[PDB]
Amino acid sequence: ITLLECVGKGRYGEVWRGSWQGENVAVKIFSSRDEKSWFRETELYNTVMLRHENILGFIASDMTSRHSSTQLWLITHYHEMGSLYDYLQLTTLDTVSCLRIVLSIASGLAHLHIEIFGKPAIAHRDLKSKNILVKKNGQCCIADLGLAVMHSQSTNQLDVGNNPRVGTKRYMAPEVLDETIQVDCFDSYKRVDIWAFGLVLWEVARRMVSNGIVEDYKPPFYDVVPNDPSFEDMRKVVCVDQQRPNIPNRWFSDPTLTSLAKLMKECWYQNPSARLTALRIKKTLTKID
Amino acid sequence: RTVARDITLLECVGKGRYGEVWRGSWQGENVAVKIFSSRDEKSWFRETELYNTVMLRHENILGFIASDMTSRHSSTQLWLITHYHEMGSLYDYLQLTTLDTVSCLRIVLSIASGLAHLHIEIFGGKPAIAHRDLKSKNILVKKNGQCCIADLGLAVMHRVGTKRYMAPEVLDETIQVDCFDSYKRVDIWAFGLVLWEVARRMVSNGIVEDYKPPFYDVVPNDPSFEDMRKVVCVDQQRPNIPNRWFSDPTLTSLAKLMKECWYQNPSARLTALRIKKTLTKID
Ligand SMILES: COc1cc(-c2cncc(-c3ccc(C4CCN(C)CC4)cc3)c2C)cc(OC)c1OC
Ligand SMILES: COc1cc(-c2cncc(-c3ccc(C4CCN(C)CC4)cc3)c2C)cc(OC)c1OC
Ligand SMILES: COc1cc(-c2cncc(-c3ccc(C4CCN(C)CC4)cc3)c2C)cc(OC)c1OC
Numbered sequence: 056i057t058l059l060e061c062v063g064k065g066r067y068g069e070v071w072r073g074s075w076q077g078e079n080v081a082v083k084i085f086s087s088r089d090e091k092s093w094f095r096e097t098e099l100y101n102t103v104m105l106r107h108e109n110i111l112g113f114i115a116s117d118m119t120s121r122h123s124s125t126q127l128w129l130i131t132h133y134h135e136m137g138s139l140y141d142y143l144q145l146t147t148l149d150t151v152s153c154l155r156i157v158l159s160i161a162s163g164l165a166h167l168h169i170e171i172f173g174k175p176a177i178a179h180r181d182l183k184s185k186n187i188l189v190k191k192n193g194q195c196c197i198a199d200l201g202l203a204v205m206h207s208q209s210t211n212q213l214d215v216g217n218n219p220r221v222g223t224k225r226y227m228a229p230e231v232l233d234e235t236i237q238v239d240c241f242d243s244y245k246r247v248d249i250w251a252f253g254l255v256l257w258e259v260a261r262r263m264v265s266n267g268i269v270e271d272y273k274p275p276f277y278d279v280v281p282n283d284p285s286f287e288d289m290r291k292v293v294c295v296d297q298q299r300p301n302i303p304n305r306w307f308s309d310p311t312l313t314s315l316a317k318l319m320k321e322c323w324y325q326n327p328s329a330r331l332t333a334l335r336i337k338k339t340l341t342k343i344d
Numbered sequence: 345r346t347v348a349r350d351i352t353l354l355e356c357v358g359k360g361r362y363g364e365v366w367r368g369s370w371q372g373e374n375v376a377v378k379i380f381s382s383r384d385e386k387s388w389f390r391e392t393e394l395y396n397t398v399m400l401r402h403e404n405i406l407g408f409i410a411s412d413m414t415s416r417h418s419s420t421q422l423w424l425i426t427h428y429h430e431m432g433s434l435y436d437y438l439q440l441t442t443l444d445t446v447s448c449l450r451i452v453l454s455i456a457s458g459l460a461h462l463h464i465e466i467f468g469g470k471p472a473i474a475h476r477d478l479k480s481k482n483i484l485v486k487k488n489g490q491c492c493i494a495d496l497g498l499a500v501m502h503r504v505g506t507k508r509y510m511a512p513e514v515l516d517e518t519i520q521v522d523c524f525d526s527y528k529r530v531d532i533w534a535f536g537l538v539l540w541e542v543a544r545r546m547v548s549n550g551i552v553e554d555y556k557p558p559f560y561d562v563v564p565n566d567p568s569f570e571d572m573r574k575v576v577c578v579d580q581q582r583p584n585i586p587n588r589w590f591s592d593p594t595l596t597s598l599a600k601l602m603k604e605c606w607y608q609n610p611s612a613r614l615t616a617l618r619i620k621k622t623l624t625k626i627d
């Protein structure tokens with residue numbers, strides 16, 4: 056493996072564009088603070104039937120050590136277009152491109168949520184536009200399974216893993232922010248994913264042009280919380296103030312954006328059991344034009 | 345910067361139901377590569393989770409190098425990479441080799457040292473660890489005459505064990521499964537059987553016993569759970585101490601030590617730290 060350039064550096068660790076056997080690969084080196092994510096991601100990628108066009112493809116995972124130093128590596132396919140977050144910053148979308156992006160994310164999420172009889176049912180727990188990569192075919196793939204929860208219907212087994220990491224604060228569902236979420240209930244984790252999906256739908260739809268109008272890229276709740284919002288800042292707006300992302304009135308002139316606004320509201324009910332399923336979101340997006 | 349990951353597999357040194365172990369080469373150095381069967385994937389995950397929790401480093405613990413997971417077309421490939429000990433397992437070594445007093449004590453004190461390191465919680469450190477499959481095939485002989493403990497695939501931090509080495513409370517299913525000290529006491533029982541296997545190969549007054557595994561004279565090869573229960577729990581049999589040991593001060597002391605690892609009552613058994621102290625006062 057040859058490490059050619061750092062494409063990301065944060066509390067998580069670092070991601071490198073590298074070369075391996077003549078192909079671009081992505082090489083994530085985890086921070087020691089996030090060792091439990093590395094192991095959880097490795098448990099998830101053990102599953103051969105996880106592989107899917109809308110899930111980041113795995114090549115290898117390694118833990119290496121000499122003396123008291125440990126390195127933790129995850130090697131994946133490389134997506135040179137970067138994350139959906141990166142992509143939306145300076146690109147606008149037409150109807151076809153906007154629906155292709157969001158259907159592909161719904162397709163990835165429905166694939167995670169639905170058990171294959173194999174691949175367990177999987178809830179992601181940190182869905183957000185930085186955790187979605189854009190592919191040269193205009194579809195996306197979901198990345199970062201370090202917080203994932205797994206459930207097996209045949210044996211009624213729930214594997215919540217061992218990870219004190221929590222979701223990205225800006226995307227946390229009301230029940231996560233107020234800590235009332237039912238921790239022994241697999242459906243609870245799927246419903247957190249649906250909330251976050253609705254927020255990603257909103258971020259994407261803002262960038263779709265209608266009638267010569269488009270919104271600038273903004274992250275969820277940009278208008279109502281401080282920069283670098285705390286857990287308590289988010290709890291205030293989502294749980295106390297019952298805030299949801301605003302729907303620009305220009306959307307109601309466009310049938311596609313009207314349909315997407317309806318879908319993102321059905322992701323944002325305070326009652327988690329009221330939210331749409333990933334399969335239902337996929338079927339709705341398959342029908343919308 | 346270049347990350348040279350390739351390991352050349354050179355010769356197979358072990359093949360079983362667990363998978364295979366190979367002598368391999370990395371940057372001109374021997375390493376040992378354990379390739380896991382589908383059957384035994386959980387042993388890879390457990391050892392990896394433990395080493396991700398605490399990077400164990402001790403002269404009498406097989407040295408960790410790497411855990412690798414590689415995506416294949418239709419399967420996941422799982423390798424554990426460690427230090428390579430060309431002399432092989434204690435089991436292997438005892439078949440042909442006899443021991444003198446110094447080599448016997450050096451072997452058993454090195455095993456006690458590695459086991460006490462696993463067992464002890466260090467604050468500030470490492471969690472306490474019980475091995476749960478200690479046996480002479482899971483001990484490697486180093487060129488300096490000391491041994492190291494291998495295979496933490498069943499280890500517990502605070503697959504079942506090899507039946508021949510199971511303590512009575514494991515066979516009669518009375519072990520207090522919620523209680524960490526219970527697992528230390530299971531290891532001490534197994535340690536006592538290993539000490540018997542080694543002691544037999546120590547020469548005194550021109551006499552040595554042939555290598556035999558524990559309970560070779562009372563159970564079949566691949567004994568059943570029931571075969572072991574009847575011997576260890578119902579009849580309360582223990583390995584034979586030969587008369588010739590009682591002419592030799594070292595083997596007399598080691599017979600006493602192994603008795604104190606084999607009490608039916610787990611809480612009566614010696615601790616690994618007490619075994620180390622006893623061994624440093626022998627000879
Ligand atoms: C997995 O195993 C082996 C790895 C290596 C190896 C190769 N490149 C670099 C390194 C290294 C350099 C520097 C640090 C530290 C130093 C101080 N501080 C600043 C934190 C960072 C850590 C690691 C190593 C250890 C060599 C080995 O053998 C010669 C290994 O054994 C098979
Ligand atoms: C989210 O999570 C993981 C992501 C990736 C990953 C895979 N392909 C491409 C990338 C990428 C490349 C380049 C940019 C550019 C964007 C604009 N500008 C030039 C700065 C940088 C962004 C992103 C990444 C980050 C790999 C991972 O593991 C190896 C991830 O973790 C699972
Ligand atoms: C991915 O996989 C394998 C990798 C290796 C390997 C080969 N060269 C160099 C390394 C290395 C070590 C450590 C650093 C440190 C330097 C200090 N810096 C602050 C943090 C990072 C960099 C590089 C490694 C880990 C060997 C393997 O096998 C023995 C691997 O496969 C299991």
Ligand SMILES: COc1cc(-c2cncc(-c3ccc(C4CCN(C)CC4)cc3)c2C)cc(OC)c1OC
Nearest residue numbers: 357365376377378424426428429432433482494495
């Ligand atoms: C107990 O288990 C594990 C053991 C090992 C391991 C480490 N060094 C050396 C060995 C070995 C080398 C050589 C011989 C023979 C073959 C050559 N000649 C004909 C006589 C001697 C036997 C044994 C092994 C098997 C590694 C492991 O993990 C990678 C093990 O699993 C944790």
